Design a protein around this ligand. Structure first.
Ligand code: ADP
Ligand code: ADP
Ligand code: ADP
Ligand code: ADP
Ligand code: ADP
Ligand code: MG
Ligand code: MG
Ligand code: MG
Ligand code: MG
Ligand code: MG
Lengths: 7, 371, 371, 371, 371, 371, 7, 7, 7, 7
């Protein structure tokens, strides 16, 4: 992901 | 000595003393417990945190809300919060003062009954009284006639009152409220790659909502605007320094109040339940209600929500009818203020339910309404 | 000091002082009580409202009429209205002035007797007198010969008088009156989807009736006209801003006075009872009565009712007979005015029934007619 | 074959065959038609009802009396009643038997003439004869000398006869009768809050009258008695189970026969017209008439009316004169019985007016009096 | 060929053929549409469901009732239901048979007119006729005299009939009915923590009502009993396997029919409107009506409602009056049965309104009442 | 010509042609690059390896997964894998066939958008469509109603569908999946002295997991058993011939799905999210969902996971409710199979997004859902 | 009224 | 309804 | 709640 | 009657 978690 | 008011609504606790023009202690109705690991019970650790404590350290805590949709689900934690208030936030002895509580209309009888049991057992409250939030809001406005839309975090409700006479047949209630708006927002942020899933992360989303969301006057055209390249996007800095960009979510979120179908509910929009409630009432009242729509509660704090509602009702109501939305600068504390006023009234005094009566008459007394 | 007149008819209270050319206090004979919820007895609420108070707040009140068909059915409320008059509307001390009351002919003796008991007990009226409404109407016209059709809300009656000599054998009475017309109208409005069922809604219907209804000259042809597309339909704006359209109800309603069968009554039409009353009277009177038909009372306020009656009687009466309908601009207050006049007369003075006499002779005195 | 008698008086029809000691068919002279709604002409409904049929279903019918004051006003309905008699009550073919009719004295000639036209046209009565009711009553008593007071519902009349010679110059007639007494009673019951206004309700009043009214010996003292608390009040149960209390109306009603001024009439009381009729007659008859006052008709059925009349005449007549009121147990059927007797007489036979004669001589024949 | 009957009342559709002793097709008057998401129009989905289809899949549907208080509000859906009946439930060609419809009394004229337009346009009904539900109920009982209380889901009405003659002046109507009872119950269940708010959930509440509610003979004492620990509580298993406990709601719900004030209405209780209706009628009818109270409609299916009404009327009526409540095992289908009977009658046949006449005379014909 | 299906899930690529009963090409979603030294660019070396190539030579390669939690993070490598598929594994020209892709629900919009850009740019796919993995799984089962738990390597998700109507409001998602289980196992193996830290070593751990792990029915008792000397330990031979012994890790690993707290997550266990999802749905659906729990995805391949879930839900659900876990032999390929079916449907055909449309309408089209 | 009509 | 009550 | 909704 | 009184 972009915010929260990686991906 | 000095009656105190505790608007322990579903989500945010607002307490203070009657006569004051503002709450003395305002903090989240949250109890947090260590997430990642059990507590070092023989060392300087702390089993749980409350309110601002929990919020401050939320990164390692699982946060819970004792109250859901205006119903207390976790009494142990509820009790703990009341404890926290009296001994950490107000820092007063509860047995010294009358307690005015608030409550959303149409709850399980056991909700009220259990609260009073606690107040006359865990605590030793001299006397107490439970009042409806919307009603109190009307007192804060000081108007004798109107219809009140109180919409907090856990619950939304609507109560019409005419010339000092409550109309207890057109009271409406939705469990659609700020909590759902938060959840919805949190969900749709996924579209931009922003993932918020933990309870602490939920808390962050709440903050975002409160700062960037606004109510579109014309949702569909607002969408078109947002679709085009525009200035609607705003930035927001997350606690860890990252910056996120919010686009059309800035109004797709609060819009849900006008279109509950977004989250799978059959409920009519709040502008429709307002209208319908008025239609359920006697034709000779209707006009006065139209000119006295009083909004209160934190979910009415969105920029332009009054204007939107003005528009929506205008469309539904007769063309010769004057629609007037009342929305004071202090909507957020309207209920608490109303409580302050009511508690200080000389006639009100006769309604306090004493411990004596509770012990004698028993629990059923909490539903009396002699006034 | 100054005799006062109280035309407390069945439906509307018209009070004032003798010598004045118009009533001083005119308000509905209505007592209203909180409908939706009991009264907060320890707080600033009000158990009941009277007259214009009740009418103004009728949206939350159940309204009652103490008087039905000229008979007082609820003495507690009747008493309350008289109280309201003396202390809120006229604002005078009743023990300071003689009281001239009015009454429809042919009532239960107990009606009159109980009123006088109250006037000489709850109140301390120095002296009083009860007169027949139609008779007083004739005094207002100032004519010595004629036949009077007084038709109010609760009751319609007809009294012939010849050369100052009342003819107490041809007095006729119908309970068909404005109240029934209101109810009937209210019913037939159903045909257009307009539902009025509550007491407050009834009140609205009354207003409509008074503003849009008129008396068709030729009912059957009027119906044909209404059946065709026409200008007979009128609009009316309801209190809540809605607009309704009234068509042939504008005359199907008042028509009932000429055709009582519409509401299931065997009574002859008012034009027939007028005629028949005249037929019951001596042939040497008849001519004079025909030329002096005096109409009074609010239900004679309909546009063209005089013309309709002119026509109807003309048909029934001999072709060489001159029929003349008298219908002054002030029919609505005719009775009250008559009372003003009578009370101010020097010979009338000797008929006042004093409290002294009441106490000595007893209740039976109220039926004396020495003059 | 067997002459039949039809005392079709104004109000009650009493028919039967000559030779029988009592009427065979007795029922009200009433025709009733559906009030509230028109008749379902394509379904099993009935346009009109007669006599007991109408009376039984009167709650939904408007009842009319074809005969008023002994004069037939509605021939269509009159015809219908005769039809009902012959085919539903007696159930015989009218063309098989002579018909003896009765009639009050001093009617419009056309009344009689039209009846006979019908009897010789709608019906095919072989022969018929019209006789005076009072005369027949005398035959029933079997006395040859006397004066008869026949007072029915629609009409009262008085006929003196001396030694078998009628005295056709002192026949008197009043339209004051049972119908008026009924109406009067109905009116004064208003004083006690008992309202009877519909035709069906009138019928009820009639029943009350017949069961509770009596003739006071001394009206004024009777009033004084009634004024004091007393046993004069009686109860009566109405058809719907309600119970009413009748006080001094029990004699204020029948009193009207002795004081016609109660209803606005100039007529002398029946005791005065009796006396006066005697005074109009030759001095050598007077004594015999005084000792033979024969009363008949339903309005003489009131308890004590004979005693009252005894008293009244005694006062008017000379102190040496013996006044004797004759009032047989069967006054109600006196006329019919007289008809039975007369029709069976061998000399009477020669007076029948045949259809043949009617057709030949014409209508004028009905006024012959050859005997 | 064979007239068919369609008791399309407000809430439940009962259709079948005349001559049958029971309806052939009985299903809810419900149209349901996909709630959570729009329809996959290019795939095997279905836009809407009707009756049992909708009820069966209600979990994902928003259910609507085309008819409210006996007035059709959504013609598109109404049409759809009629379609469903003819082609899915009865599966017959509507143009082959006469159609007898039913209707609550006192509707907007346009309601009836529009229905007939559809029947002679969308459908090609040979001929049709609209009858009043209460009237038909009386035919089912086979009694010629009585007063009928037909109380369905959307509307309650009361029609007196005497000896085959309808009394169209004392027809009364309340919009208080089963729908309101359902809603009320649904509301008060909140007290025990049972929340039902969606339309599908409403449907569940309806079922509960029908199985557990009963009418208390003495409401106040019944409350006292319920207050004490008792056997009044019953369990009920919800569709998802949860079990709920119903206490005093088992009678606080149906009680509303006797005390309409519970839901904010001024209406008198059904026992009072029955009584009052009788009082409005002629005194010679009253007795017969008292002994023939016929109840019909689904809301009279509550256990003991007859006994309760027996008691209530007994108190209001005279002590010598025999009160008899008629309440056949088949009240639920009384109206339909009545229709079956009426349609099969040989005289009835002449009342069918043909398409020919509709086209010629026009829409106004639907209000004829020649019979 | 023949639509092809590419279930390019996060971790394993399963591709084939519609109509086939099994995937044609199944290989890991891995791109590997030389670790120890740069590539001899002027000699016969190879810059990168894909799928089985990389896996086979992993000893000298650093392996990466382009897709993480269902989100493509490395587009260059993703592109490379698609290339590898089309030209090395299926060996077909992509521009000749429609492409059905799969996707986990609730991804950043840009994920989908970028994929389609590539498919209409790097490749020249005629037309394509992106479908939700769980939905497709349901098609494979052939059931129209149920709730699907699809749990792959990178992501776990849960989608309820009722009678062919998706319920897009209760779709839940966890990033907890097979990848985390692998990592966790890898970590806890440290306890026995087994160190796996390189990417290639990770791959080995994955294999172990798949062969030795199973789901304990009763975790706590299973632990007790493992604590005692027992047969739970299993051997496993590593690639280099060494043999390792696995004890209680054989179930402490997969247990994490039921207790996410093991790896520091707040997520409820998969049995709880299943239950909760059902609770979020309408009460009239719930029963059907309980009897149709469909599991799919490689992480449901553990021995006894169905039995464990059966137990867990049974405890949470009502005792009268039948819980049924559906877990077909082919869970591993359920999604792909579903794709095969869907792609072959005649109605589905109309949903293909053509390149033409993409070029005209633009990227936003990929989120359409007309069906 | 008491008998006949209401009042 | 149109005026009074909904229907 | 107990039935309907969670609370 | 025709003149005087009704009948
Ligand atoms: N400025 C704001 N804009 C939007 N929402 C707000 C704002 N301030 C508070 N809220 C929302 O109001 C709710 C809490 O306010 P309050 O009405 O006091 O709740 P409650 O009365 O239920 O305790 C939360 O849902 C919170 O996000
Ligand atoms: N302009 C009007 N047109 C028709 N009816 C009227 C009008 N004004 C008053 N009324 C009717 O007259 C009645 C009241 O008038 P009034 O004669 O004073 O009654 P009462 O004498 O019985 O008190 C009511 O029925 C009212 O509707
Ligand atoms: N017992 C009775 N007491 C008083 N009046 C009676 C009685 N019986 C009958 N009547 C009255 O007598 C009249 C009818 O009797 P009848 O003499 O036969 O009338 P007619 O001769 O006019 O037909 C009615 O006015 C009826 O009320
Ligand atoms: N056994 C029962 N007990 C209580 N109410 C019932 C019962 N059966 C049906 N009802 C109610 O009756 C109404 C429907 O019955 P019905 O009289 O046919 O309605 P309608 O005539 O309006 O179509 C609904 O309100 C339904 O809940
Ligand atoms: N027999 C098995 N037992 C346990 N896990 C398995 C088994 N087979 C495959 N897996 C796991 O399933 C995941 C890959 O399966 P799959 O569902 O196709 O993944 P995706 O759908 O994400 O491509 C990996 O985490 C793999 O370890
Ligand atoms: Mg609040
Ligand atoms: Mg008046
Ligand atoms: Mg006689
Ligand atoms: Mg019904
Ligand atoms: Mg998968």
């Amino acid at each position: 992901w972009x915010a929260x978690c990686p991906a | 000595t000095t009656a105190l008011v505790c608007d322990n609504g579903s989500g945010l606790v607002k307490a203070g003393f009657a006569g004051d023009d503002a709450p003395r202690a305002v903090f989240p109705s949250i109890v947090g417990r260590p997430r990642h690991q059990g507590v070092m019970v023989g060392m300087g650790q702390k089993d749980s945190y409350v309110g601002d404590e929990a919020q401050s350290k939320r990164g390692i805590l699982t946060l819970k809300y004792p109250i859901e949709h205006g119903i207390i689900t976790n009494w142990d934690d509820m009790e703990k919060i009341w404890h926290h208030t009296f001994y950490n936030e107000l820092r007063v002895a509860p047995e010294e003062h009358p307690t005015l509580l608030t409550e959303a209309p149409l709850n399980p009888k056991a909700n009220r009954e259990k609260m009073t049991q606690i107040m006359f057992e865990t605590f030793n409250v001299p006397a107490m009284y439970v009042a409806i939030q919307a009603v109190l809001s009307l007192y804060a406005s000081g108007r004798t006639t109107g219809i009140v839309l109180d919409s907090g975090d856990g619950v939304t409700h609507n109560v019409p009152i005419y010339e000092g006479y409550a109309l207890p047949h057109a009271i409406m209630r939705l469990d659609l409220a700020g909590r759902d708006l938060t959840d919805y927002l949190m969900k749709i942020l996924t579209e931009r790659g922003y993932s918020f899933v933990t309870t602490a992360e939920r808390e962050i989303v709440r903050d975002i909502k409160e700062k960037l969301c606004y109510v579109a006057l014309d949702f569909e055209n607002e969408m078109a605007t947002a679709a085009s390249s525009s200035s609607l996007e705003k930035s927001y800095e997350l606690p860890d320094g990252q910056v996120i960009t919010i686009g059309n979510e800035r109004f797709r979120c609060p819009e849900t109040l006008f279109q509950p179908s977004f989250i799978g509910m059959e409920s009519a929009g709040i502008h429709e339940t307002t209208y319908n409630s008025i239609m359920k009432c006697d034709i000779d009242i209707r006009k006065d209600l139209y000119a006295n729509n009083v909004m209160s509660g934190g979910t009415t704090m969105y920029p332009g929500i009054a204007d939107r509602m003005q528009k929506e009702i205008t469309a539904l109501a007769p063309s010769t009818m004057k629609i007037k939305i009342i929305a004071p600068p202090e909507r957020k504390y309207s209920v608490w203020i109303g409580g302050s006023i009511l508690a200080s009234l000389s006639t009100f005094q006769q309604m306090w339910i004493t411990k004596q009566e509770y012990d004698e008459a028993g629990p059923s007394i909490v539903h009396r309404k002699c006034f």
